[PDB]
Design a protein around this ligand. Sequence first.
Ligand code: ATP
Ligand code: ATP
Ligand code: ATP
Ligand code: ATP
Ligand code: ADP
Ligand code: MG
Ligand code: MG
Ligand code: MG
Ligand code: MG
Ligand code: MG
Lengths: 210, 385, 241, 266, 244, 51, 238, 101, 49
Amino acid sequence: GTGKTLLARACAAQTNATFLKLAAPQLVQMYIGEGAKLVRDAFALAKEKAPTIIFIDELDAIGTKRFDSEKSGDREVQRTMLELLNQLDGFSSDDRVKVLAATNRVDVLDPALLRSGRLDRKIEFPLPSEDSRAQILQIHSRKMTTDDDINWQELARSTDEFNGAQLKAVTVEAGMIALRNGQSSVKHEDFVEGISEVQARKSKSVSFYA
Amino acid sequence: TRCKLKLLRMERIKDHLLLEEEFVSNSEILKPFEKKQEEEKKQLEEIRGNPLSIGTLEEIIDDDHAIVTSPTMPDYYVSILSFVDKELLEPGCSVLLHHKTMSIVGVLQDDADPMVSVMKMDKSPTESYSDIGGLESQIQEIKESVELPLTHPELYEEMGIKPPKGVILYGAPGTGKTLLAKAVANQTSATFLRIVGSELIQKYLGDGPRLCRQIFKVAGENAPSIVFIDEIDAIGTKRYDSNSGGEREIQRTMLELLNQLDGFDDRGDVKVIMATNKIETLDPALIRPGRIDRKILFENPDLSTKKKILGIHTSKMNLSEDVNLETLVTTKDDLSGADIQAMCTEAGLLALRERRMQVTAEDFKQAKERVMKNKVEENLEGLYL
Amino acid sequence: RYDSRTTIFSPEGRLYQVEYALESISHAGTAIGIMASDGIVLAAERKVTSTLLEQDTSTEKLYKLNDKIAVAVAGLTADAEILINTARIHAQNYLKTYNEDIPVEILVRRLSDIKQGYTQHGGLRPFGVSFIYAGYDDRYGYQLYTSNPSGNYTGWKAISVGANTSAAQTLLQMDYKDDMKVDDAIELALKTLSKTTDSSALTYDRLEFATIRKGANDGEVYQKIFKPQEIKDILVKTGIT
Amino acid sequence: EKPDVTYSDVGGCKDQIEKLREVVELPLLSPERFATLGIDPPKGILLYGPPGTGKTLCARAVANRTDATFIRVIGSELVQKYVGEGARMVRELFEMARTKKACIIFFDEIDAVGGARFDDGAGGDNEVQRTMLELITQLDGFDPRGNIKVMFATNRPNTLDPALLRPGRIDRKVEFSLPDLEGRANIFRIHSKSMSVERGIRWELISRLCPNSTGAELRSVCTEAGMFAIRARRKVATEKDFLKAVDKVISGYKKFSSTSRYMQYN
Amino acid sequence: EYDRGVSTFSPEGRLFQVEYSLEAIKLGSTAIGIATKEGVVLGVEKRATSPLLESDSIEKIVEIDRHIGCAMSGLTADARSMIEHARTAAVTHNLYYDEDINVESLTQSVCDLALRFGEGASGEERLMSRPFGVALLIAGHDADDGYQLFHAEPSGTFYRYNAKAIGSGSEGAQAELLNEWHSSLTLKEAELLVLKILKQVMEEKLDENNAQLSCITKQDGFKIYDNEKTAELIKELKEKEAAE
Amino acid sequence: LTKQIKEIKEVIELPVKHPELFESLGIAQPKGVILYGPPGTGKTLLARAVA
Amino acid sequence: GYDRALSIFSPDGHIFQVEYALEAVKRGTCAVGVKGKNCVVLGCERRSTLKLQDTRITPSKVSKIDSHVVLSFSGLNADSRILIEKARVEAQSHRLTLEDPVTVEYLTRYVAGVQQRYTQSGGVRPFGVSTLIAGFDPRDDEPKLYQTEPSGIYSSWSAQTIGRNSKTVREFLEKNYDRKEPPATVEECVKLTVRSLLEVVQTGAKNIEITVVKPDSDIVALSSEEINQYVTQIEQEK
Amino acid sequence: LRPGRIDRKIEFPPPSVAARAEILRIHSRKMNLTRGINLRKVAEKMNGCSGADVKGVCTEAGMYALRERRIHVTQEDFELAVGKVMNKNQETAISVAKLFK
Amino acid sequence: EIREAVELPLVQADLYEQIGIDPPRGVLLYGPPGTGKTMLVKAVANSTK
Ligand SMILES: Nc1ncnc2c1ncn2[C@@H]1O[C@H](COP(=O)(O)OP(=O)(O)OP(=O)(O)O)[C@@H](O)[C@H]1O
Ligand SMILES: Nc1ncnc2c1ncn2[C@@H]1O[C@H](COP(=O)(O)OP(=O)(O)OP(=O)(O)O)[C@@H](O)[C@H]1O
Ligand SMILES: Nc1ncnc2c1ncn2[C@@H]1O[C@H](COP(=O)(O)OP(=O)(O)OP(=O)(O)O)[C@@H](O)[C@H]1O
Ligand SMILES: Nc1ncnc2c1ncn2[C@@H]1O[C@H](COP(=O)(O)OP(=O)(O)OP(=O)(O)O)[C@@H](O)[C@H]1O
Ligand SMILES: Nc1ncnc2c1ncn2[C@@H]1O[C@H](COP(=O)(O)OP(=O)(O)O)[C@@H](O)[C@H]1O
Ligand SMILES: [Mg+2]
Ligand SMILES: [Mg+2]
Ligand SMILES: [Mg+2]
Ligand SMILES: [Mg+2]
Ligand SMILES: [Mg+2]
């Protein structure tokens, strides 16, 4: 929820190159050694239409830290991880063709997966900073009613430990408050009560000491 | 002897005369209608040829066509047309094609699986109702939630509301719980499915919940129906494998139950009985009410009750020659009705050593000692003394 | 599951470790006391033997704890060894303090606490020893007891511990006589020991024997351990050899 | 297909239910309401609470109200040992629903297919979590979905995966809670509306003696009072038989549940 | 893991093992104390698991001084150690200053024994090996603060209160105390108030065998009532509600 | 191993041969019979011999 | 659940080790206490394991701790044996301090005290023994009956039963007994005890053992003959 | 072990010195006797604990007798067969551990 | 043990019937793959004719 998916979709479609739609959970299939074949057809499609960017949605299906296994169907899962490495192996006309990949878990990805030659750039997306939070609010608010009572630098400070998707849930939930009123206008107050909707709490702490 | 014969008199004559009738009548059925019926037979015969290529129906589109996928492998875009209707065709059914041009010429087949054999019982119990004798206050409880709203729906609209859904029979072993499920279902003549909860665990991973889909898919078509899940206590610590049944499955099978018995599906009009010997083993949300309603607790039969249970077993037997039958009951305190059936088992075993064919009173006293000794261990009065 | 340490119970109020400790006992040989008003015989059987095991120079399943109380041992002999030393030390402590050779009851009760104590406190192992206590005290005359490894005691007229406890007990109570003779008591111990033990011939060297008597000269208490040759002769009399 | 259960059979006067009606129903019925603001309203909604609070009752009731194809998905149909098979079920279902216009996809009881990633080097829980990964990517999409409202009833949101829970398309998270003291009277009057009863009864007394509880237990006062009606050979129910009926269900509940107190001699 | 430790923290920052001990406090019988400006009245519920149980020779209101009393719930086993320590502290204070012990200060001593959980932790030498499954309502009177009611929590530390309920019925009792309390109360009112709330949170019948009041009134000292006194107040209550 | 042969004839052989005997007695026919002991003594071979 | 260890608490708030300790009490012989007004009678089942068991030297199930307090037990016999000896060193020590004999109220606390201590700690298991302590005060003549349990909680009861099918005797007792008038004659009170004990033995008059405490350091153990006459009265009337 | 389904319990004992010697003979009778009887010597030294032992004694003897190359099977082959089956079962008991306990 | 299994009943079948001992049967070779299992089978196949 830091807007990985959205950036990729947007800026790949912006520059002009082949945008492949490929999913990690897809690569594991119920038929033996067909799942491997499907990695080979994806790279084939990239090589005809090269340069291509292959945006892989998720990366944690094949982002398996196991290929030392015991009595399981897991030997099919890790087989299509190894096939990914063989089709990121140089083999000619593959320089042009890249892989974008979004993931939510880096700690379970393989150490042969993540390392140069394959994934070269390892770019981190943090929880958005105080200013950065502010910026996201105004960018959703440019599609809906905006009042000059509102001050977006106030709201930013009072959101403490809000990721960008939670900040879509400040701005959405403000319009939920505005409708429940029966207003045909959103006020600045509705946004404060938009902050109270998600917090990962319901306005609590649970303690037997304070 | 002469009492047996009165029963034997009606039984022989009436059914064997009906057999002799039906035999002659096979011919006779054709004779009054042989120009509607053979007319219909003719027209049936003419459109469908030979053979009748059996396919398995994937799905129909309601406009007079369907997509079928045969076992012989080719898929065909058929017509629903002639001696077949759109209501008679429902997925997973086996449909009849005419071979030379696939037109759906009828459906005469829905089941042939080995799977559905498992669920159904071809049952004949040796103890039926009123050999549940005693604990009658609490048989009255299972009646109200199983037998009597099937038998009169009248009473449950006179009070209004829904008839209570299901029950859990639970308590100590030997307390006659099994015999209850089998015997209340004798009364009603409803379809008695039976599956054990040591057969709800599977030696294949993630097939366990598929099996649990099968139990109430079966229940729902053959309804009104009484589904016995016997021994659902074996869900909490009894499992076939760990790397091909595993921990995931045990929890999933219970999640599956929830959706069957009060999920959207709802699956009204399946009475569910669950016998479990411990209700503190069972899952908190499966002992949620409104899918199994009230619980009936049984305890080791009490001193007057064990008179009843002794008379049920010794009615078979040749009785005590001196009679000490009433004192047997007295010696026992805090004991099961299974001790009573193991005592008349044990009396006639001592008798079986002699390979005598009578039984005398004295075997009773011996047999009670023998089987009490078996119960008590040498480390109980080792640990203690 | 509950087959661990001693603090923990089983939900059936069983301490598995006392139950197993009982079972330790029947992996060492049969040991029998039979009480008679003429004396007590203590008789024991060897757990195993070979043809060059020396067992005619010493006893090691019959120990004197004092000069009027003696014990037969069945079970682990290592566990036994420490408990026999503790019993014997106490037996003389009683001597020093009161000028009387220790009563049979005080000595059994002491050791019952000690066995119990190793189960109850700490992380220490329970004991897996059954001692048949056969004594004299001038209160109760002749006395037989046996103590469980569990750490409790009961008085007896006959008892069998060690291997083959059930059968050895049955044959004993079948032919038992209330007054008995000392001489008959010795005979009934060989008769039982023959059928329970899986040794082909019952040899003097598979037997230890001691007798405690006040009827072998009165005024005095005489502890008579049988030597190999005395054991060897009495088999003849009973016609096993 | 839908049953005939409305939110007239779902009680309290709960605001909790109205969160359901402004997220699911209102943007399909008239998105004009949300174009006055210019907002985009929620797509998703996370439904959670204690068992027998009416999670499934609102899944029945929301199906009738919209007149939109109701789907519904069992959170334990999605596992076999042949791997990525529950990825086929979830994929094809989600693609199928793009083509229908105005749907509610009701995943019941997800706590399996809603755990978390783990590698253990000898694991087995891994095979199952594959299929949850397909669900995330189908939800957010290659392209965003819309005019598909996805409701999720979770028994345990404590397992529930962090990346379904975050409110990037599950904007509104509403707890469906225990009924209040005067909340429990309204509920109990929907079940006694079918129930044949004689006036001279005070339902607000029968609520007050009952503690905070589930509406499944509230169904166990009505049913239990009713089989005492059959046995007495009275056709109606009255107040006295409600008194015994609450006492039977409260007192029986402690016995089934665990209680092994050190207060059974003191 | 976090809960099967004893000094192991959970990822929310709660010592789970210690958390679990709060549900020990609740299993026992309800006691409801209400502080007033005339004195503190402490009531209990005492369970009878048999008619044969002598409920009137067992108590859970105890004397700690001549102006300090304590209510308790949880393990009477752990109540024996908690009450014994507290009695020692009152007496040793009396030894050292020949002066009344303050209500709060007796509470600090009861919370010191509570701190101890450990087998390695520092502060004081840890000798006690688990939490205590038992709470106190601490009642007294010093004259320089007045009549006071404090609540001891073995998993926390001393809380000042005007009224607290502890036990099984605590949660529902507490609402009623939010509803009906006043600073305009006399002890006479206050006594019929403990009883009026108690009965509703009772599942046993309201009678004198299952009840027992005591007061800290500085003038009268710590006084455990009669069964004859407690039976009177049940009648006066019944008269009041009929009128009402 | 002659006493174990007697023992299995009681509970398996006689209720096959004569099911007239156990009705006259009124004794219900046995379900479980635990054949048990140290391995290799003759446990599988006993239920074979009677078959 | 949380029976892996004693010190760890439990979501359910019940220390499992104590609960299982109770369960162990049911192993041992039944013991029943019934108070009069001038008597307490403390009877116990004396279950005979074999006919080779002495009555010459074999321990009675009832043990006098001091010369006017009496004690029976139900439980693990091994465990009871040190519990009774520990009770006794203190008991006698009570006179060392005060030059007063042992008061029954001080004594129940102490027996509950050794037990509470064992539970509090982690490196010992609790005693699997519940005891009944009967007696009168030295100072006074009103009959006193106490109980200790594994847990370390003590109570007073008018009449109370523990071990071997305790429930069935407890109910029996309620129905027979009257709290308005407890029996004020030693004989009739004995008779109530015998009737209870009859039940758990099923058959025996050589396996019922009766002991009585009376005020002013009278403790007596009843003849086997004397008990059989009471059984004779109870069989005839029935 | 629930009541009313178990009422007969057949325990196999470990067969004694006499008892093993009859099952021992039946597998001798398959082949040809030693013809002076040494079977019983075999059967009384060996305390064994299994009837599986005694069919294997006969297998080993007949394989020693193959080396020997005679129709007749001598008794010296039945001395070696016992000394091997017997020695091997004392290695499952980790020396003379019965002695040490 | 394997010249005992293969070579000795192939040529001297008469001797096994003469003692009254059963023929040898199937031969299992099992163990980790270092062990030389194959090497012997190749060997004995040449010599046994
Ligand atoms: N920085 C942001 N600016 C705008 N909207 C954002 C931003 N962060 C999150 N969102 C909103 O939340 C949605 C969820 O984030 P998105 O899928 O793009 O990324 P992610 O970090 O890979 O998360 P996940 O894979 O868990 O969904 C976005 O599509 C967008 O609507
Ligand atoms: N009240 C009774 N009337 C008649 N027979 C009884 C009665 N109660 C018990 N029985 C007899 O005892 C037998 C054994 O009990 P049954 O097999 O029904 O077990 P259960 O209590 O369900 O145990 P579990 O389900 O734990 O295996 C019954 O089949 C029946 O013959
Ligand atoms: N708000 C309510 N109004 C009326 N009846 C209710 C209400 N809540 C619960 N119920 C009753 O309780 C029954 C069980 O509740 P339901 O199946 O709807 O719950 P849930 O919260 O999804 O539980 P589960 O954990 O089993 O999924 C309902 O069928 C209904 O009879
Ligand atoms: N006893 C030996 N003398 C000579 N060479 C040997 C000996 N044992 C093994 N070798 C050699 O070791 C090598 C591998 O052994 P071999 O081919 O017999 O494999 P193996 O144990 O059957 O393996 P697998 O488990 O794959 O069947 C061969 O070259 C073989 O000649
Ligand atoms: N006591 C015995 N007498 C004869 N052969 C035996 C004996 N015990 C085992 N065997 C032989 O070994 C084969 C397999 O025995 P096994 O499966 O171990 O069974 P059991 O439990 O009957 O000893 C038997 O078919 C038999 O030929
Ligand atoms: Mg993403
Ligand atoms: Mg059953
Ligand atoms: Mg639900
Ligand atoms: Mg076998
Ligand atoms: Mg090879």
